[PDB]
Design a binder for this molecule. Structure first.
Ligand code: DQG
Ligand code: MN
Length: 297
């Protein structure tokens, strides 16, 4: 009955020498990490960027997420500040589990998330501050843009190769900016790959962990076949870009069908890299703040 956690994806803890450049580092770990689809990177302990969003004016209208909307086939929106969203998020989680938010084990949130996704008896609705452009209120990383103050001790982070604003994003051919995610408990993203099969890199600036699931690219077609077998018939014929709006699937279902799935809890201050055509999905353990961008090698 209970969710069975997938095996853990690789975690790398590069020394300062190895931490010199994301592209060089990712190229070096690729023989392992491309076989798990996702990996986690823990920066050296002394690498701690300051949070550089304009928190005063940070306002947003999160999207509403009904966990069991797909099983349902078988109000709208409030404006928040970062602060008021956090107060709502913590209240929701502590009320839901009847304990302080930081005392809820990550395995319990995970088990309850997947129970709720398939539950026809309990309708749980959460909110996700998803796809907030970093051009709106700024990146979470400091940038030498002249649109905000950079202290001297923050300049190294504005120039760091691991600053997501400094990733190479142009694709080579003869023929843009990071996105922000303000999470609460159970807010989620369903299974998808990136446009152009790009890499993506994801940084959790602060807050409670983000739980990830990843599938290596050599199993992409197997996952797509399981999806096509088990997706609602009304959605079976949809183009992939539209189907990926609603590709919610319990990782154990994929695993029972022979699809390799790995998991990780991304904690604050840690990066998650997804490799080309590595399907991934996840959910937030609680109030947090993430930044993500696609890049090409
Ligand atoms: O939330 C996270 O931390 C997270 C981590 C890794 N990848 C993703 C992908 C999403 C979202 O993409 C929405 C679609 N936009 C994508 C970027 C801008 C263009 C259109 C998404 C996809 C499915 C269902 C819900 C959500 Cl929010 N969130 C992710
Ligand atoms: Mn993604």
């Amino acid at each position: 009955a209970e969710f069975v956690p997938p095996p853990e994806c690789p975690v790398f803890e590069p020394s300062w020498e190895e931490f010199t450049d994301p592209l060089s580092f990712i190229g070096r770990i690729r023989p392992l990490a491309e076989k798990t689809g996702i990996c986690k990177i823990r920066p050296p302990k002394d690498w701690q960027p300051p949070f550089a969003c304009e928190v005063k004016s940070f306002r947003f209208t999160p999207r509403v997420q009904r966990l069991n909307e797909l099983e349902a086939m078988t109000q709208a929106v409030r404006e928040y500040t970062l602060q008021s969203f956090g107060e709502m998020a913590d209240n929701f989680k502590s009320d839901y589990f009847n304990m302080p938010v930081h005392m809820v084990p990550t395995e319990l949130v995970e088990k309850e998330f997947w129970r709720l996704v398939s539950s026809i008896e309990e309708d749980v609705i959460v909110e996700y501050g998803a796809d907030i452009s970093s051009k709106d209120f700024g990146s979470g990383f400091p940038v030498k843009d002249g649109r905000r103050k950079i202290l001297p001790e923050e300049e190294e982070y504005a120039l760091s190769g691991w600053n997501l604003n400094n990733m190479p994003v142009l694709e080579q051919s003869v023929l843009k900016v990071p996105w922000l995610y303000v999470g609460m408990c159970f807010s989620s993203f369903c299974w998808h790959i990136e446009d152009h099969w790009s890499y993506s890199i994801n940084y959790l600036h602060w807050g409670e962990p983000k739980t990830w699931y990843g599938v290596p690219s050599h199993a992409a077609e197997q996952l797509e076949e399981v999806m096509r077998e088990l997706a609602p018939e009304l959605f079976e014929s949809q183009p992939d870009l539209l189907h990926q709006l609603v590709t919610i699937m319990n990782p154990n279902v994929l695993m029972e069908h022979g699809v390799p799935v790995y998991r990780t809890n991304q904690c604050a201050g840690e990066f998650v890299v997804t490799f080309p055509r590595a399907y991934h999905s996840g959910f937030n353990q609680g109030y947090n703040f993430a930044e993500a961008v696609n890049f090409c090698t």
